[model samples]
Target: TRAQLSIDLVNNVEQQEKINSMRFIVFGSTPGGVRLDVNEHILLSTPETATDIDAQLLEVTSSNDILVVVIANEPQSLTSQLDGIANLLTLQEMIYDISSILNSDGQIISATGMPMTGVIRDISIAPDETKTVQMVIERAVARVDVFIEAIDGGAVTGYTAGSTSVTLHNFSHDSYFVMGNVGNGTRDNADSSKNYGKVKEDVSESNLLTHSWTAATTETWAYSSAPGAENRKLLCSFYTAERLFKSDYSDRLSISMANVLKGPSDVTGITGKVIESVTKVDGTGSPTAQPFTEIRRNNVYQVTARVGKIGIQILTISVEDW
Candidate 1:
């Protein structure tokens, strides 16, 4: 009898839409006891709209301890099929490449957003036996949600009610696809961070994005309530690949104070929006240059920022798991 393989996605059905295709890599031999060459790959093609993936390895039962490599999103680094040993090594070398996350136009390349991968190891599909593999098909990117508010002890005067703007800077662009894959690469090893995304030790910065250009983003909120200019909250969010850049990144959530009638007035005699006209408050308080270097896939980072009269202060950096 031939062997069988079925994959069970541990994530919910609704989340399945993100993964429309799959690469099922097998590490085992033919029933006749011969190691599979590169014919050990199974494809789910396109899971089709509105349909949940019902992917099965069809039938592959090699004599070697049969293992599984579940990958999605069609990584260009991977071929449709790979030899057994290579598949195993590549599975361990998996990366969610975030190096060149942006395009020449400074726009986000959707394909660079995130990927899904699962490594099912040490399972046996005895000859003529059926196997059900359980793996979590997860998004390989992290979520960064930012909110800018105003804290007490700050002053806002002559501020145009509707001209508040915030532009944030410095977020890491590259990262180890899997948190577990960090520090596993060595110079003598076949998997080098420098070669792929960031493996090998002393890996020169080749794949790193152009630094300042990729991670800088801006968010704006319409002046609701005529710019209370105080306690303003804007939920600006971004999803980026994993990063551990620590203490080396310059990150600031900056908001613009504009069109103020800076003469000596907190409010107008019913004419606050006219006649006076111009103020730019600046000063980066703590969290101004926070060393935010730990980003993990499928995780959420809450950057709660407060803009006081003194300036912007990112109160805290909190985290959550997806």
Candidate 2:
């Protein structure tokens, strides 16, 4: 005896915008070879769209009876063409790789350019029983925005703007952090660099909250005529990190500024902080060990480098997520 299977493809509205279309495949094995299967491309809109598919009845058998349904957003032609003859392992790998599809909000796209896949391993043709399968899709990427600012209080020396490069790290996909070169017009804004854009969802627990930036010149301090310390230069960078869920703890880092005198007799010191809400930790070793608050989203962190004397140069080092 042969058995029949029914599948209902449901597209839920997780985001406000509409998803245009979806493609799907259904297949199983039979006595002759891999059974003839169903391939469909369907359009969806508004309130919630669903379409039903009925697989051709197939002869019942223990090993080849189960059917699989694979659905995705505008899948590539070659992938949609995979047949039931293809091994299950190969099929699953293709589905998982589609995990990179994303929406504007940084949510993983499950239905649009993304795959929502499932399997039906058991089958029966009893008159009283109906075999129907349902599948739901979702977005899984997270959105992050990083902002960098440099506050040099009119000291007007050292620290060239474009010479520093800022980068963000720890994403499931490659080069998730994209930098934008929106530098203020100045001599220092010469060589800014960044990646493409957007952070993706967390694929593993070993995720890293990482970033890197280099000072333009080794000399830190610049000359200022003001009575007290004045900011010599400031730099800011902004970007996003991919997270599957809201992080329990915020990110934190330490930035320290020191002024080295051209001569031992010159005044040599600098002061700065992540932002006003966060206080700057002073000194090193035990002083560096002092605990500071964690970083939260949408918070603006500022670093100011000031020179204590006229002939002294400033050197800054940032300890990330310490």
Q: Using Cα atoms with residue i matched to residue i, what is each candidate's TM-score against the true structure? A: 0.56, 0.35
Tens digits of per-residue lDDT for model 1, 1-322 = 3577777656634434355445566666555653432334444444432235564555775344554555565444444333333544545555444444445544335553345655444456666777776566555566555555534454432233344223333344444443222222221235443222332222224433222211133333322344455345534455566555434332222222222222233321111111111111123342333333444565566554444443444444444344
Model 2: per-residue Cα lDDT at residue 298: 18
**C-alpha local distance difference test of each model:** 0.43, 0.36
Q: Give me the overall lDDT of model 2.
A: 0.36
Stretches > 4 Å off in candidate 1? 12-17, 29-51, 62-64, 77-87, 94-96, 99-113, 150-239, 243-293, 316-322
lDDT of 2 at 130: 48
Give the count of colliding residue pairs in each prediction: 11, 27
lDDT (tens digit, per residue) of candidate 2 on 9-124: 45433332234554445544556766535555555554233333323233233333444444434434334445332454344333222234644434445555333333343333
Worst 10 residues of 1 by lDDT: 271-280
